[PDB]
Subunit: 218 residues, 8 copies
Amino acid sequence: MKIGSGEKLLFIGDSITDCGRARPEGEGSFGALGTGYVAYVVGLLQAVYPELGIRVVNKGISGNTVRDLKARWEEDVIAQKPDWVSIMIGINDVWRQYDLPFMKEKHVYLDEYEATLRSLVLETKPLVKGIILMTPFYIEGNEQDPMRRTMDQYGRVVKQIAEETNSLFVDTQAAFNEVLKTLYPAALAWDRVHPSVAGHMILARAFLREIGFEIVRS
Amino acid sequence: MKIGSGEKLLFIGDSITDCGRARPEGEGSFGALGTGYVAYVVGLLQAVYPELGIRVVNKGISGNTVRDLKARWEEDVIAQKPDWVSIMIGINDVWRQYDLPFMKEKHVYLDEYEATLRSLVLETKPLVKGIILMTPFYIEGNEQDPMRRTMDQYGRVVKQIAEETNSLFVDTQAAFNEVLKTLYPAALAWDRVHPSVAGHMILARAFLREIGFEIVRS
Amino acid sequence: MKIGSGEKLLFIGDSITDCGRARPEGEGSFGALGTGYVAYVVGLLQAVYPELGIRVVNKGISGNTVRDLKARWEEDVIAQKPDWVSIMIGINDVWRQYDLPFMKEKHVYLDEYEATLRSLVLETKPLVKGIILMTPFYIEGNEQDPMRRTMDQYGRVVKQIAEETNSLFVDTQAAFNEVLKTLYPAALAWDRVHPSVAGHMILARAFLREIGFEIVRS
Amino acid sequence: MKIGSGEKLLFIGDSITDCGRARPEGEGSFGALGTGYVAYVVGLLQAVYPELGIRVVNKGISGNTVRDLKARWEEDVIAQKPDWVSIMIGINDVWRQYDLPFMKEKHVYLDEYEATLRSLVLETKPLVKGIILMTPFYIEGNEQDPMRRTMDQYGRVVKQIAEETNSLFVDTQAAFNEVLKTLYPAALAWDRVHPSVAGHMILARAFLREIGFEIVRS
Amino acid sequence: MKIGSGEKLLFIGDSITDCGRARPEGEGSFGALGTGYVAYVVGLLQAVYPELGIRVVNKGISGNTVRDLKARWEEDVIAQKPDWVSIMIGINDVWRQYDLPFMKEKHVYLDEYEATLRSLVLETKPLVKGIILMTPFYIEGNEQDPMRRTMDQYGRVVKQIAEETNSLFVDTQAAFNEVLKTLYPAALAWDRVHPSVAGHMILARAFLREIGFEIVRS
Amino acid sequence: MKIGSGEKLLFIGDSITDCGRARPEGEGSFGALGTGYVAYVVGLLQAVYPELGIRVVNKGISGNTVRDLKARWEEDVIAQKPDWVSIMIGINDVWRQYDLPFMKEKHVYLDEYEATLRSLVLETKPLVKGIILMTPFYIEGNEQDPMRRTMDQYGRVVKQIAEETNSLFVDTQAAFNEVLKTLYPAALAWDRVHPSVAGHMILARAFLREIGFEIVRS
Amino acid sequence: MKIGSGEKLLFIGDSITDCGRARPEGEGSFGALGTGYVAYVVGLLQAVYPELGIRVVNKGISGNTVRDLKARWEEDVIAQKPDWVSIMIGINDVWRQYDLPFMKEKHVYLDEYEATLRSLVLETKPLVKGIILMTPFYIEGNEQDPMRRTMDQYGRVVKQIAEETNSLFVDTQAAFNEVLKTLYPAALAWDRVHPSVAGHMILARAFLREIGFEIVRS
Amino acid sequence: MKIGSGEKLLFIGDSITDCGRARPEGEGSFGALGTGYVAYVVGLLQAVYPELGIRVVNKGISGNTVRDLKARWEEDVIAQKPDWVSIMIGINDVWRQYDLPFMKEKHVYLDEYEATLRSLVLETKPLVKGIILMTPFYIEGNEQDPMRRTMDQYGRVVKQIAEETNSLFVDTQAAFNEVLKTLYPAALAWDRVHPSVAGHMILARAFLREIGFEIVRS
Ligand SMILES: [Cl-]
Ligand SMILES: [Cl-]
Ligand SMILES: [Cl-]
Ligand SMILES: [Cl-]
Ligand SMILES: [Cl-]
Ligand SMILES: [Cl-]
Ligand SMILES: [Cl-]
Ligand SMILES: [Cl-]
């Protein structure tokens, strides 16, 4: 287990992280953690490792890009004095390119995404025990679908930043890809982004694996 | 796995089971499955065994005792033609005795409990592939608390019904008792019955273990 | 115009048709017609051909397959004594196969689809002035995406039913496919089914073209 | 087509423009454009000219007179840096004269309307590619009805300003008048101002014609 | 006064009458009487003639034509055993012809109007103390506006039915016409039908005059 | 008629005046005037004297005493530049003495009521054409009921102030007393303060009489 | 105590009794008992005599007269098999006479009141352990107020029915009259019927006294 | 009676005190006092001692610890100029230790509780006539249940502070303990903190006893 008792683990990202979490505090109660992978991660850890006295805070915000992360970083990350910070961002940075193709101001293109994401990592790195970088994902098994293709380029950036900064790394796309061998995307998410419970469980599983709790087939 | 692809797994019980499931159908989306252990079970199995193509229905109803199960059994169980039926009932049968001590008609005493549960199991067993009997529970580590002691007695009934009928069996009390070595009950459930996400995870993990998916530390 | 003054045009289908139409009557105001392509058709015809005194009824119901159409056909179509009946059904018949792959009873497979649609058209044809068969559609430009491929197969059914019965015919897929040369699907519909105003305009424009009002560039 | 790809087209006016648009931004989504002629214009352009990558913003506000326009001009027009600005105002300036005849402070009489409207045009003109002036209208075919009479005087002012300032011009009254040869006003608008879908389609058609997309009978 | 103490006065009609009255009973409080001319009549009579102990029931229903009155007459009039019945119907009978010109089944043409109203009056007359026939109205001072002209024709029917049956008679059109010498219709009713408090006062004052309480200037 | 065309008449007081009026403006619409005597007064004047082009504003506020009036006087009276001001206050000043007998800070005793009311009158008097002072009232026919007794002392103060300052005067208590010869108070107001429509009509009648519109029996 | 452990005490009456009790059952929680004197009685007995294991049901319904009690007596009293029945009815029987003086069919005059109450008591007496008749009341200290005088007459009926049938008897008027030596009615109930918590306490204290729990000063 | 007429008694604490009271004032109405023991205390005093003209204010706030009390003390206690202050705090200070065991910042441990509580007492003591210190409580009869054990240590501190500062003292735990000889905790409070009406009555009784109104068995 990478995380120890008494440590504070903070999650940040977009709607996939948010999942209705309590604003602004994002702690004090699972209600407060929202109803997706963050809550699942906390619940699974309490069920299986109840002696691991970790404090968890959810600072996800629906709609956010990496630009939006940067704008709130000081208040929502640095000021919370976390020990561990998990980041999952990029879905919107990409999505907007595809759903609002002519609203170019809402697009965060790859060079800016990369640099800004790296900046957040390295502002945080000296202040914390560790960082977990989770890739964005798109629930689409065709690697040539334009938005899945773009997404994978963003995810490859995340992986490079993780390696460069010695952060922990979760490839959320690979976790989905395995299930997409079996299920059509709609079975997980109508819009290929916001998943069912099962999709949140895919996320929670992938996260937990990287912090040293690996849920496998019997 | 005990359960196979193409098989229909139907959960029945009280609020622990219900968790806001869609009425009457209790199927067709996880929204429809509610927000507790049933959904968690379905989601964990989809995340980890997506090729296990089980169809799941949630027939939980808040407040029910086994007397209420009997009254709706034909419509809500038999007529659904399930392959596997999971029963978790007894919390209310017990609780009423302690929260409304003088309203004896709302109590389901051990004789009624045993005879009705037994009868439901024997009636159902020839019509289905299998039955999973889950014990009621009370989130209270003191075995001499009166309601805990009672609940343990109802759980003994369940265990013996399952042994006799060769049903699968989940000891939910023992699942909570392990966590209660660490946590005071209010950390899981203010009222000792309705738990947080973590409590629902305890339940899902105990269910899954008995059907052959065992989640363990490491 | 194919349709004349004083004639009753009745639209039937799923949510694409429904769009929040007034239940049960589906007539007596545009509020009553809902907020999608049916209303747009009625409004464009009133704006451009106000002397075409058509009466329009919207009998769309969200979620329906052709199996549901059959169950309500006497009350919602025959008993309304329409002059023209417009049918757009198949999206759900298909989608269920992909979003709920294991709930086979919610699937309407090609044999059921063809036989039921065919039967409805032949039963209705002698009772009315004319029938307009609109294909289902899937807003996805990759012909090899599994659900798109399926949907194209259901559309082939529609096209052949219409040829055989001398019904009018709208190829809604081809209408979307032209736009999909330019736009990624999420620009029209996050879930590839339920579109923006622009998607409803695509639909209304294809409908109108087939009844003899062709909107073209310049 | 007067408008080019990558250009920003901004609509301003009263409730007829507003139609429930998102405040304050009025962009990002059709929901955000509201449910009337502005949304229709955007939808028709996307359906028929999807390669015309125009960005559209709706700054309509229910209740507004030309006075109200002037009070918000800098924030809601100039600061948005539009390429094209469409204006439709005057309905309320007139209406109040008739519905609140003794509340004279709410009345905007013709000399002030003219001068203030011209001022807005010529403050904007050097900053934009072009301007589209849409007349007010009143859905009343009797040219001697007092409020229709007044309205026409306002519309004649708009036309003079358009000619004087070399703005594009839409005579919304003429567009209604054509349909009023056939329909009584109540068929379009109970209150002779806020129309049905069809009335919004009349507006959208008239607008589109002037920017070079002319929808005609087949 | 035409009406005496201890007598039951029942009002029936459309929305003008209804004004949000309590359903089904329409009695037992003014809340129950709604917020328009019925309530105003009752309140003025209580304020000025408190010893006139009349009991008043409001059976207005929004949207009704005389065809709807007939369908409910036994339950909502006869079975209430009133002493006096006040009828104001025809606005919708007319309006539909103009707002939904092509939905001819919603129209109640003069032949149906006259025969049904006449029949209701003659059936009712032997069972009650008296009948008060109030004309429909249209708040429009131009006698040549088509809907006004129609409405005047329906009012002629009412007037002649009342003469023949020796019913009391209120000319609501003439009551509005006097005010329309001063005010444009929108000052009383944007849609020319549903008026402000002032319009309801016009109505109450005309009703009261015919039952022998005349409110006059000075 | 004391009031002339083009003049502004402003009403101020407590809930009896307020009656749900629009805050803060209290004008622009009858909705905005609320649903009691103020609206009735405006409606009766429009119905009978539509050429009297008066502008009316309702600044009543539920719960107010004369202290509360004084605290808002400058904004809600003086700044509105009325021509005529009507005041009805004192019900709460008295009521509190009786319903909250030990919360003495909420009580406004007679010497303070008198002086403060006079102060408001004489601050306004030089600024306006005239003032109408309406007595408080209590809908109770027993002159020895403690709260009716107190009320009458307040009303006698109002009358003295009116005489001293040459203001117009409405004795609302006398208007109620006449009807209380016939009806028990509950028939008008359960709580002997907030009346039915009829009670509001009693008020409106009494007000109108004093400004020169006297509604009498035929 | 007059009532014993294991006995079912059922309260029936109007809104004073109802106080928002759960419909239809009126039992199973205090929420279910409503928020007035019934709940207070149950709570005081539980606080002070917790070993008195009484089961309490609230069958109050707002608005009821004794005529309404009769209509529901079989279902809401007899079929509940109570041991003790507490009746408090007459407020509405009286009040209607004064608040709706002309709606004589809503009045329950003394002859109907006495005969119906008497009949209910005699029918019920052989089926139960005991009956407690509580007088209606009117919170008004002037014995010559008309409605108070009436109410006192109905209370005399109750007192004499109870004497004759050897029922227990609570004089609620006398309980209020003692407090009314100090407090004006509006301090307890603006409408003289529906009281504050203090009024419900007066009621509970009078009930309790008659069943042998007397709360006294010191 | 320790408290005299004309004195102001102020209650402060957590949810048990709060019970939905009006914010911020917490006075003016029982609605405003909330629906628990504070309201009961006021009601019982008004019912039995209506001449005791005490003014009562409820400043309870749900969730509060002694830290939270200290943060609002000046505004919510000192500024209100009470004559008597009742304090009941500590439930949350303890609870958090048990329900959120790893969120240590939310815990108020005993040495801080003691000192801070004493500080509030002695800041208030010179300013008031007297102080009533009510112990926290936990509705659990097992003195060795960890949270009941902790609670009792807090209550013993309260008692020591009361003795040291010559404050009045209510042992709320002892009052519950007596009833817990008979009832299981769930019969009073599912969560062992927020009780039924009966539990609030236990509290009100215990409070009243200490101020000299002792409610005993007959
Ligand atoms: Cl998002
Ligand atoms: Cl339950
Ligand atoms: Cl659908
Ligand atoms: Cl507007
Ligand atoms: Cl109507
Ligand atoms: Cl008030
Ligand atoms: Cl009642
Ligand atoms: Cl709390």
